[PDB]
């Protein structure tokens, strides 16, 4: 008679494909944190983030974190298709000590840190057509140096400017030079942004410094997948309903265990 109030305590890996977060969140796996290299091109129906997760790369920030977290979560895939942009006149594959991959200075595997090339840095203009029948998700960023000498030593430009535009939208970011508290031995930050390119629309980038260029796109779609914050371990069982407190049988008409759920779950 009374509605269900008990959970098994674990989340069943069936029938829904459950990709677990462990030390990696969806955004760190999206950017390519070295300790998240095992999540490349991996799909899911429900991605579960853990409280023990942590970042171990370059200190960054995402201004609108939630919307970018919900875009990748609803698509249910981290499929990345590399694209060759014409970064003529600049150097690529910038690395840092705060992002160690295989005990070597590295960077976000999905980002290309453009820096100076022989004390020369031209106004980069590149385009990308998007000839497909689906939306593309480009992940780019803007680097915030610590002092004016770092801004000069890396880009040889007194003021940086970055602009990412399409046929519908445009995004302009200005780097803010200043001293940040040291994080993994770095007094600098990076601001991560994104731009959706619809079919038939062209991507455009006019940057005169501090560009964290992308290496490609992700296949985005408003699918059925989602994301959930939970610490309950994943067990070997089947269960049509899933809650942050664990899997739940969907036989009773209601349930009072948590307001968040996924699947054919009776009302909370």
């Amino acid at each position, epitope marked *: 008679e009374l509605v269900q109030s008990s959970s098994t305590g674990r989340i069943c890996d069936s029938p829904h494909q459950i990709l677990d977060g462990e*030390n990696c*969140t969806l*955004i760190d796996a999206l950017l390519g944190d070295p300790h998240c290299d095992g999540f490349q091109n991996k799909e899911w129906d429900l991605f579960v*983030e*853990r*409280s*023990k*997760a*942590y*970042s171990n790369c370059y*200190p*960054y*920030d*995402v201004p609108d*974190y939630a919307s970018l977290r919900s875009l990748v979560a609803s698509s249910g895939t981290l499929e990345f298709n590399n694209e060759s942009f014409n970064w003529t006149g600049v150097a690529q594959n910038g690395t840092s000590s705060a992002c160690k991959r295989r005990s070597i200075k590295s960077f976000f595997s999905r980002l290309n840190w453009l820096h100076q090339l022989e004390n020369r840095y031209p106004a980069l203009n590149v385009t990308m057509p998007n000839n497909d029948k689906f939306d593309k998700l480009y992940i780019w960023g803007v680097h*915030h140096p610590s002092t004016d000498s770092v801004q000069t030593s890396v880009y040889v430009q007194a003021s940086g400017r970055v602009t990412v535009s399409t046929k519908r939208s445009q995004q302009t970011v200005i780097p*803010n030079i*200043g001293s*940040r*508290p*040291w*994080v993994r031995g770095v007094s600098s*930050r990076i*601001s991560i942004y994104w731009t959706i390119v619809k079919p038939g629309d062209i991507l455009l980038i006019n940057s005169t410094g501090n560009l964290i260029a992308p290496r490609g796109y992700f296949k985005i779609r408003s699918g059925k997948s989602s994301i959930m*914050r939970s610490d309950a371990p994943i067990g070997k069982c089947n269960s049509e309903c899933i809650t942050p407190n664990g899997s739940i049988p969907n036989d009773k008409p209601f349930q009072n265990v948590n307001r968040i759920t996924y699947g054919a779950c009776p009302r909370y």
Partner: antibody
Framework: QVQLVESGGGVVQPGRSVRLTCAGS????????MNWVRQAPGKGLEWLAI????????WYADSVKGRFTISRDDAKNTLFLQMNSLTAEDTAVYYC?????????????????????????WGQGTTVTVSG | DIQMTQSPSSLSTSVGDRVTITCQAS??????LNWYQQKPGKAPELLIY???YLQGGVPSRFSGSGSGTDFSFTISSLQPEDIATYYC?????????FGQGTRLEIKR
């Protein structure tokens, strides 16, 4: 000149509310957060509360949570600290300090936006005395 | 809820000697640790930030070191204008907690 001047400190009866005011000039106030710290007479320094740059991130100490509420007025560049239900232990010199947190210095961990840092600019401190 | 222990509670040295006070955290806080000076009757003054760095305007005799759980604060040559009580503050996580405090006195 970067300074933080505060007022609102005085003798107040126990169980009554008090509002502390702190305003500062000489720096971009809407570009950092602020902190509150009190010091009991002869005792050490006890931390109290924090506001981020946009007022969306706030945290109260457990000895203070529920009792006090902290607010921000960027138009006047003024920091506030509401103190409700004052007991005898609240006799302390309440200081006003700076977040040392640039709006952009928000390095992400797992899910913790690590905006909280040390204090680089301090106020003078108003003496708040709770007694009957 | 991270505890900050500060030892000793007080010490006594002469002018010109090397003074070293420390600060032990109850868990790993990386380099998210700061050092302050509180002269008698005044407000705290920031001296060392991020465990290792020295704030501008502070003499070079001051310095800090450490990472993880144990940190050190060192004055290479004590001066009469250094008589104060020094605290250590973390910011690894919330809540931000201070140390007990170490008072500087004179001997002999």
């Amino acid at each position: 000149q970067v300074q933080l001047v505060e007022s609102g400190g005085g003798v107040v009866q126990p169980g009554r509310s008090v509002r502390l005011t702190c305003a500062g000039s000489g720096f971009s106030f809407s570009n950092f957060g602020m902190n509150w710290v009190r010091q009991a007479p002869g005792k050490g320094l006890e931390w109290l509360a924090i506001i981020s740059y946009d007022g969306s991130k706030k945290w109260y100490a457990d000895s203070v949570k529920g009792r006090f509420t902290i607010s921000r007025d960027d138009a006047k560049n003024t920091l506030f600290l509401q103190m409700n239900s004052l007991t005898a232990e609240d006799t302390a010199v309440y200081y006003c300090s700076k977040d040392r947190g640039d709006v952009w210095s928000g390095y992400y961990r797992g899910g913790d936006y690590h905006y909280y840092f040390g204090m680089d600019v301090w106020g003078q401190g108003t003496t708040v005395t709770v007694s009957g | 809820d991270i505890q900050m222990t500060q030892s000793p509670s007080s010490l006594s040295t002469s002018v010109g000697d090397r003074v070293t006070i420390t600060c032990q955290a109850s868990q790993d806080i990386s380099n998210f640790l700061n050092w302050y000076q509180q002269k008698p009757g005044k407000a705290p003054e920031l001296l060392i930030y991020d465990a290792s760095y020295l704030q501008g305007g502070v003499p070079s005799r001051f310095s800090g070191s450490g990472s993880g759980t144990d940190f050190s604060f060192t004055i290479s040559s004590l001066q009469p204008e250094d008589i104060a009580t020094y605290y250590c503050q973390q910011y690894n996580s919330l809540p931000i907690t201070f140390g007990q405090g170490t008072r500087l006195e004179i001997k002999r």
